[PDB]
Design a protein around this ligand. Structure first.
Ligand SMILES: CN[C@@H]1[C@@H](O)[C@@H](O[C@@H]2[C@@H](O)[C@H](O[C@H]3O[C@H]([C@@H](C)O)[C@@H](O)[C@H](O)[C@H]3N)[C@@H](N)C[C@H]2N)OC[C@]1(C)O
Ligand SMILES: CN[C@@H]1[C@@H](O)[C@@H](O[C@@H]2[C@@H](O)[C@H](O[C@H]3O[C@H]([C@@H](C)O)[C@@H](O)[C@H](O)[C@H]3N)[C@@H](N)C[C@H]2N)OC[C@]1(C)O
Ligand SMILES: CN[C@@H]1[C@@H](O)[C@@H](O[C@@H]2[C@@H](O)[C@H](O[C@H]3O[C@H]([C@@H](C)O)[C@@H](O)[C@H](O)[C@H]3N)[C@@H](N)C[C@H]2N)OC[C@]1(C)O
Ligand SMILES: CN[C@@H]1[C@@H](O)[C@@H](O[C@@H]2[C@@H](O)[C@H](O[C@H]3O[C@H]([C@@H](C)O)[C@@H](O)[C@H](O)[C@H]3N)[C@@H](N)C[C@H]2N)OC[C@]1(C)O
Ligand SMILES: CN[C@@H]1[C@@H](O)[C@@H](O[C@@H]2[C@@H](O)[C@H](O[C@H]3O[C@H]([C@@H](C)O)[C@@H](O)[C@H](O)[C@H]3N)[C@@H](N)C[C@H]2N)OC[C@]1(C)O
Ligand SMILES: CN[C@@H]1[C@@H](O)[C@@H](O[C@@H]2[C@@H](O)[C@H](O[C@H]3O[C@H]([C@@H](C)O)[C@@H](O)[C@H](O)[C@H]3N)[C@@H](N)C[C@H]2N)OC[C@]1(C)O
Ligand SMILES: [Zn+2]
Lengths: 105, 60, 218, 159
RNA sequence: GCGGGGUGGAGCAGCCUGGUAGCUCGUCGGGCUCAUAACCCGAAGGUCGUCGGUUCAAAUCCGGCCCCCGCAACCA
RNA sequence: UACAACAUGUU
RNA sequence: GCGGGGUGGAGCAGCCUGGUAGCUCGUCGGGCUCAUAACCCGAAGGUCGUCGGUUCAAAUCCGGCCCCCGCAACCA
RNA sequence: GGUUGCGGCCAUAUCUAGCAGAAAGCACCGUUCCCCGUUCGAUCAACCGUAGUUAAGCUGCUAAGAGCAAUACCGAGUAGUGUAGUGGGAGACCAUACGCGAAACUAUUGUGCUGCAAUCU
RNA sequence: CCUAAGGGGGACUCAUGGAGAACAGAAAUCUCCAGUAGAACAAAAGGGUAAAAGUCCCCUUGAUUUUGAUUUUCAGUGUGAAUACAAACCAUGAAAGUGUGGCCUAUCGAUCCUUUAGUCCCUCGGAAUUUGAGGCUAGAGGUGCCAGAAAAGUUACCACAGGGAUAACUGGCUUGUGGCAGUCAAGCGUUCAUAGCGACAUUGCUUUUUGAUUCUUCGAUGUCGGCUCUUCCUAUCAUACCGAAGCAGAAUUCGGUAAGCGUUGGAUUGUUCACCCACUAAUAGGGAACGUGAGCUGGGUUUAGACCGUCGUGAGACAGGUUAGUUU
RNA sequence: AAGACCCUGUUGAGCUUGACUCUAGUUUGACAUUGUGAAAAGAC
RNA sequence: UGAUGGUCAGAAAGUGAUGUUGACACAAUGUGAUUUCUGCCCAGUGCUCUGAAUGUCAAAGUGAAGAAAUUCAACCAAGCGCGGGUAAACGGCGGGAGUAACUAUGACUCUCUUAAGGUAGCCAAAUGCCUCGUCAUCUAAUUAGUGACGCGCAUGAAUGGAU
RNA sequence: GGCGAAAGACUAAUCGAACCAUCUAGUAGCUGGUUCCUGCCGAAGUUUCCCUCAGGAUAGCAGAAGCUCGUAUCAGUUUUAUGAGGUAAAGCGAAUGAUUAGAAGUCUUGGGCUUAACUUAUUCUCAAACUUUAAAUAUGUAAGAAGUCCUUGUUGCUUAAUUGAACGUGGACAAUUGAAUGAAGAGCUUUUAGUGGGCCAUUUUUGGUAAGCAGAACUGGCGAUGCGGGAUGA
RNA sequence: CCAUCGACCGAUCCUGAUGUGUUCGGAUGGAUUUGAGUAAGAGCAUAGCUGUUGGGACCCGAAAGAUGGUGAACUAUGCCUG
């Protein structure tokens, strides 16, 4: 999958509410905070005696992740997220396909 | 050891005909759900105007 | 190695031919279907005698091979190869299957029984109706009894019941003897090797008239 | 394993008729559908958009909604011990007017005409349809038609 | 219950997929030598274990009669 | 540094 | 029910990851020796078991078949 | 009635081989400054209707024509099939009773019908 | 898997074959003709498509935003997938139109937790400010046992609740396999198909083999063989009488009526079986809950002790071998 | 004698281990117990 | 294992066993009289040793930023990793081709490969499936016994070999 | 825990973890039992989900209570009209695939007068995953009052429009209100039981040599049912 | 009581007047959205049958697990005295 670095789409920002130019990047999840309630609850449950107090997932089955596109409007800087289908190889702004060329291995 | 019957429709129509098979009931005015929104929007205003015109005509 | 033929006698299954869906199918034991003087002219062998099935069953290719050899050998031995034309009129297109259960002691330990019991190709058989022709032999009228005896011997090679019928028709043609003679005297038949061609009053007039110069338009 | 996809078992039902492939004749797109019309559903395999499910192939229903390129048809489907009202959106390539309805409207018109005729003429006309009655009596002449005797024929073989 | 295997005097090809039998070891003639051994060149040599069938035609496809190596071969 | 062997039988 | 292999004459790589078939021994030519062996300078030789498919392109990926080697076949 | 433009149904309209076509229309046909498109004014674009032609397109006619379509004391009430019996037959199967009912084959016939608008020896 | 292989427009026609053109040949490129698709359309198969859905060219991002209705699976719940509209915003084209991913039918994922986007809106409850935290709407991180526990073995020391819903005997159904009998007649038999045989085929019978099945029995029908004893079957080994011969005699072979009467002694093996020795008129085959354990025996099998080999890190395993093991 | 073989049960137990989750012990560091001096390398 | 010790006990203790002890001892294992012998392998799993040399590495501590909660960084114990030893530790101890003047066999050669490729012995053995192996002996006759043979499914050296 | 010249042995007839009391009426999707009569109605072994497969939940089938009405419009049926289908049969000198035999041409296409390919007209035989054709049975819809006709009202939808669309006002058609037969009446609601092992027969049908075998379809049965008959028998 | 088109209240999306602690306020008019709402109340209390959940939970039934105690008169092993 090859996706261009720019994409003209609808912007929900109240200044636009129309198709504007967006700059496309790949979404990457932020780091897990040590002070989120769920993590503060987990640490308290794990302290003391009793061993592992929650389930740890083991039976991995998927080999891909859905790629999320981060679309930032070039006007108002509003962000939009867009998920794609599962793919093993993803790149942004790769060289476009050209057919009718003698392949030159 | 636990092999048993997989599937059958035996006796199923007999059960269905004890209290069925009932036709659905019809009404003079159908629900306008699923009807085109633009038509439904204007049909509201047409019925409203008819009521006013008939009320006025009944008044005089 | 062959099960007795009673295990595959009757047409219990839908036809199962060699195709894209069962490739590894062994060949039939019968290869030759036309025996004797197959290059003979239609006029040479007027008498036609049929061995007709009286059963709705499956005839193995081994049975067809045995019957062919028996009838051919007897008629050739008594009246020579040139006295007849014998044709097998059924082809074994049905594939038989076998489950291959081990026949030793202790087999219950190894084999799986009726689990996954779909069989492997086992042999070939022809499916025949009641009243279907199994073998046809055209010959001269003077060789009638020898051909009947040849077909009588070949009958014992088949399961079930079969009849030997003398046909009213001329050789392998679809015309009675009198109809074939009437067509012949009007110049509406020509030899096409072992068979003939008939006049059609439809189509290109000039081509038809060239094809049958002896035709007597009436 | 088993396969129960959306168009499973439609190998022949959705094929086009023999030597009837290709473009849709424009009379299909010129018919006019109104709410309350009775239409027959027939999937056209060349139009993949707005298709019926295989269940509704060959069923007949009432039009309840009219959109740009399609109609909504009401079908009654048996589910267990009762019918369920089903609502299907069908592009007009998969729909056709039902002929029995036009015949019934013909009968309504004719019946009103006859009743008006009888009214203005001073008599009464019976307007219910009737099933075929037993025939009445009749006398058959033998002029040129002397009864001819037939007998069962003997068995013969034509082999 | 039986896979399989029987081809020159011997070890092997040729089959599968019918139309045509090759090589090696050895035998006999010559070359070479003073004469040999070796080596080189030539040549003879199997109707395909036996019989019957299918076929226009069988070493070849099918089945019998001989020989052989091997394997399957109650139970509780 | 490395260097193994020379068919049989005579006159 | 299976898992591994088939590549110059021999034994082995390259396969994992499609674009040039590599190593040791062996064979052939010439040299060195009276000749041999060793040694020295040069050359040939496998379409990757077969039948197909996929691909721009197959030894390489997939399917069927042939030959080889072994694993497993338990509770009564 | 011919012809053209736009059609409906979509071979009775298609295909092969010959012949004929008055008028009008359609067509082939001439040219390249201009809008335009090509390796190529061949197609496509424009211009002239002027110089030529019914050769081709198109239309109609012909053929024991191919295909297609339709009909039937054609095959055949045959194949098949719904219902029934303490029917027949070892069985495969078969007959009967009350009903429905093919396809191939055989023979004969036919070869576009038509809507709107304009136009014509 | 695809930034096109998505969306729109345009132009063109594919597989294949024939006849031609230097190198050039069967396959290089050009030309014409035929060509209903015999091509192509990512990937299975089926459907669909020809002035196109195929090929090439030009422009694009509708693979977008907001939530509703509907179809399939269906409980008419969820998930996946799909259909037709409404309100926007865009693309393309002269335009009518078409476009809410891939021509259609598969290509996928809850609660809790984390993370990101959005209003930067709500809350931190004595009142504020700023950090931090918690909420509301929409996605992502994943459960393939795919409506979604966090999970290695062994037991031959064993336990319990049950099961004839289920295996290990007998019995029943079946009869492939085992055993036995027919039909035909290519050949063998010095000639002669059938004295005696009998290929290729083909019809049966039996339940003395072994399977297949799982109907009965798991609040138990004592589970090998031998010994002992009775009886039954006949598909007859001997004995009685006879028919046939490729019956000179002798011997032998084929067949009939026949189960009245008999069918042994031993070496090795737990053995059934097998294999030899010997006698004999002959040393036929079978059944009776694979006859027969409150009749025995206990060699084997099949508890617990022990040894070996291979396997396993190990506990241990082994229709592998070995020795000892209460018979009411 | 509510089969001890076999199977089932979201019934156990004895034993084993590179199963999951822990644990006595043991070892390693910091701080406290913990005070009084000197020399030499470092840092404000 | 030389006592500030090894092995073991206890909830703890100013607590114990060995110990009225001291390497000719105590503690922990394996093999199993004598005779004759105990081959090769430290790659794996363990056990052990070195750290002057160092990647990773907890709490405390150190530095920087910040209003602070906090964040980030550097330094950093044992361990891990790296390197050496060890089989009377657990254990292990190979394939494929060609080759001698009848044939057959293969002393001999090539090649693949291992940590090493089963040595001395022994054997159808309580260990060999095939298998009632083959030969000999024992008997009238022997799936028994014994002696031989050995590409040994799967014999073999203190998991002790042969006597 | 002990003790063990080691058998998981022994530790008071108890040992692969003693005995005693208590937690404790421990839990059991499993086995057994579950106590008077008559009357009326009366099943299910099927759907979906579940570490679900000897169990639950869910729908279905059943009972009870009724409630709103009183012939409205209903039916496991026919008739008339009008659709859909690709199974039986059929076909292959019709497409795809399979397949026997000659004949006539082309040698330009390959071994040696012609074995073979190729083309043309013929010829024998086939298909669950082939097909032009194509039943019987089964199957969708309609047969009016919520209908038809005339005139003209509403609307922000639609049309070039006074065009339409939908819903209406007013007027016309009245028991043949627009086929048959039947109708212990129609419609509506709540709530809850058991069940969720099935099995048999005709026909269709899959695996299997077959089976009192295993698995589907429609119907009728047995289960849950006695009675007359088949001697006996779900 | 039923079918249907509206109207009112809360949530969601849009619009955005007079005015202002100039960032608040939110008039007004819209939206195939959404609620266990409104639209001349129907509830509370006691009792009964049936159904549900927790409890010994219709009755009897494990193999197990835990807490605190009693045994070396049998037997195992060491020691002392015969
Ligand atoms: C040793 N060299 C030999 C050379 O001698 C020759 O060998 C032939 C050999 O081929 C012949 O061999 C042939 O002989 C005839 C053939 C000629 O038709 C056949 O009948 C025979 O079956 C076949 N073996 C044999 N008969 C004689 C040798 N010298 O050719 C072969 C060769 C290897 O080059
Ligand atoms: C400036 N005046 C504004 C007015 O414009 C309007 O603003 C809305 C605002 O209400 C919405 O805001 C909404 O945001 C979330 C949402 C989950 O409902 C809620 O937390 C919040 O209460 C709600 N009002 C916002 N999403 C869009 C603005 N235009 O409503 C709020 C307001 C204060 O009256
Ligand atoms: C008394 N000793 C006998 C000894 O005579 C002999 O007996 C056989 C016997 O076993 C045979 O029987 C054996 O063999 C026949 C086969 C030949 O048909 C089999 O059918 C049968 O089942 C089998 N038991 C029998 N036919 C003859 C006796 N002499 O062998 C067995 C024995 C025990 O050694
Ligand atoms: C025309 N097709 C027929 C079809 O009609 C039907 O035929 C049945 C036939 O099978 C019935 O017969 C069947 O049932 C009877 C009995 C139990 O009723 C049995 O005796 C008989 O063996 C059995 N074949 C017969 N009684 C009526 C026909 N219509 O089934 C057989 C068939 C060939 O398909
Ligand atoms: C804002 N657009 C509205 C549209 O939302 C709708 O209004 C609904 C209305 O129909 C709902 O009302 C619906 O549901 C209620 C029930 C929930 O109480 C019923 O009482 C009522 O009969 C029913 N129509 C009402 N609950 C909310 C409005 N926004 O009515 C049409 C509309 C004017 O276009
Ligand atoms: C007499 N005036 C009535 C007034 O009383 C009221 O009537 C309600 C009626 O609207 C309700 O009905 C309403 O809400 C029900 C509900 C089930 O959703 C629905 O049928 C639908 O939304 C709506 N018709 C009905 N259930 C009760 C009457 N009293 O509603 C307004 C009204 C119709 O004008
Ligand atoms: Zn923006």
């Amino acid at each position: 999958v090859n996706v261009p670095k720019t994409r003209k789409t609808y912007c929900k920002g109240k200044e636009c509410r129309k198709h504007t130019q967006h700059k496309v990047t790949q979404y990457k999840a932020g780091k897990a905070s040590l002070f989120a309630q769920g993590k503060r609850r987990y640490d308290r449950k794990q302290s003391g005696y009793g061993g592992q107090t929650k389930q740890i997932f083991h039976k991995k089955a998927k080999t891909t992740k859905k790629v999320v596109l981060r679309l930032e409007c070039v006007v108002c800087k509003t962000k939009a997220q867009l998920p794609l289908k599962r793919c093993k190889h993803f790149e942004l702004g790769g060289d476009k396909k050209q057919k009718g060329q003698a392949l030159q291995f | 050891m636990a092999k048993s019957k997989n599937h059958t429709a035996h006796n199923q129509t007999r059960k269905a005909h004890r209290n069925g098979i009932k036709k659905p009931k019809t009404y003079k005015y159908p629900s306008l759900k699923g009807v085109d929104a633009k038509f439904k929007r204007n049909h509201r205003y047409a019925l409203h105007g008819t009521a006013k015109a008939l009320a006025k005509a009944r008044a005089e | 190695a062959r099960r007795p033929a009673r295990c595959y006698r009757y047409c219990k299954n839908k036809p199962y031919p060699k195709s894209r869906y069962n490739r590894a199918v062994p060949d039939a034991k019968i290869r030759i279907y036309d025996l004797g003087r197959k290059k003979a002219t239609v006029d040479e062998f007027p008498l036609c005698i049929h061995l007709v099935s009286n059963e709705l069953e499956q005839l193995s290719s081994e049975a067809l091979e045995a019957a062919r050899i028996c009838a051919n050998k007897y008629i050739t031995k008594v009246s020579g190869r040139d006295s007849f034309h014998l044709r097998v009129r059924v082809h074994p297109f049905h594939v038989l299957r076998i489950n291959k259960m081990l026949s030793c002691a202790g087999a219950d330990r190894l084999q799986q029984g009726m689990r996954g019991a779909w069989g492997k190709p086992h042999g070939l058989a022809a499916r025949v109706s009641i009243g279907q022709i199994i073998m046809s032999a055209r010959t001269k009228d003077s060789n009638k009894d020898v051909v009947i005896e040849g077909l009588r011997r070949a009958r014992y090679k088949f399961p079930g019941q079969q009849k030997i019928i003398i046909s009213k028709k001329w050789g392998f043609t679809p015309l009675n003897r009198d109809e074939y003679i009437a067509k012949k005297t009007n110049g509406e038949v020509i030899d096409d090797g072992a068979y003939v061609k008939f006049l059609s009053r439809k189509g290109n007039l000039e081509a038809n008239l060239q094809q049958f110069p002896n035709y007597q338009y009436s | 394993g088993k396969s129960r996809g959306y168009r499973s078992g439609t190998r022949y039902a959705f094929q086009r008729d023999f030597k009837k492939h290709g473009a849709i004749p424009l009379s299909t797109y010129l018919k006019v559908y109104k709410v309350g019309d009775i239409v027959d559903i027939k999937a056209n395999g060349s139009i993949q958009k707005g298709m019926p499910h295989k269940y509704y192939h060959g069923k007949t229903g009432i039009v309840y909604n009219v959109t740009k390129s399609s109609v909504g048809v009401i079908i009654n489907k048996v589910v267990g011990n009762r019918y369920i009202e089903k609502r299907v959106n069908l592009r007009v390539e998969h729909v056709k007017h039902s002929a029995c309805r036009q015949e019934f409207l013909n009968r309504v018109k004719s019946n009103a005409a006859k009743k008006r005729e009888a009214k203005a003429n001073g008599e009464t006309v019976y307007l219910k349809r009737q099933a075929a009655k037993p025939r009445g009596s009749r006398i058959i002449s033998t002029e040129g038609n002397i009864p001819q005797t037939l007998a069962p024929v003997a068995y013969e073989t034509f082999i």
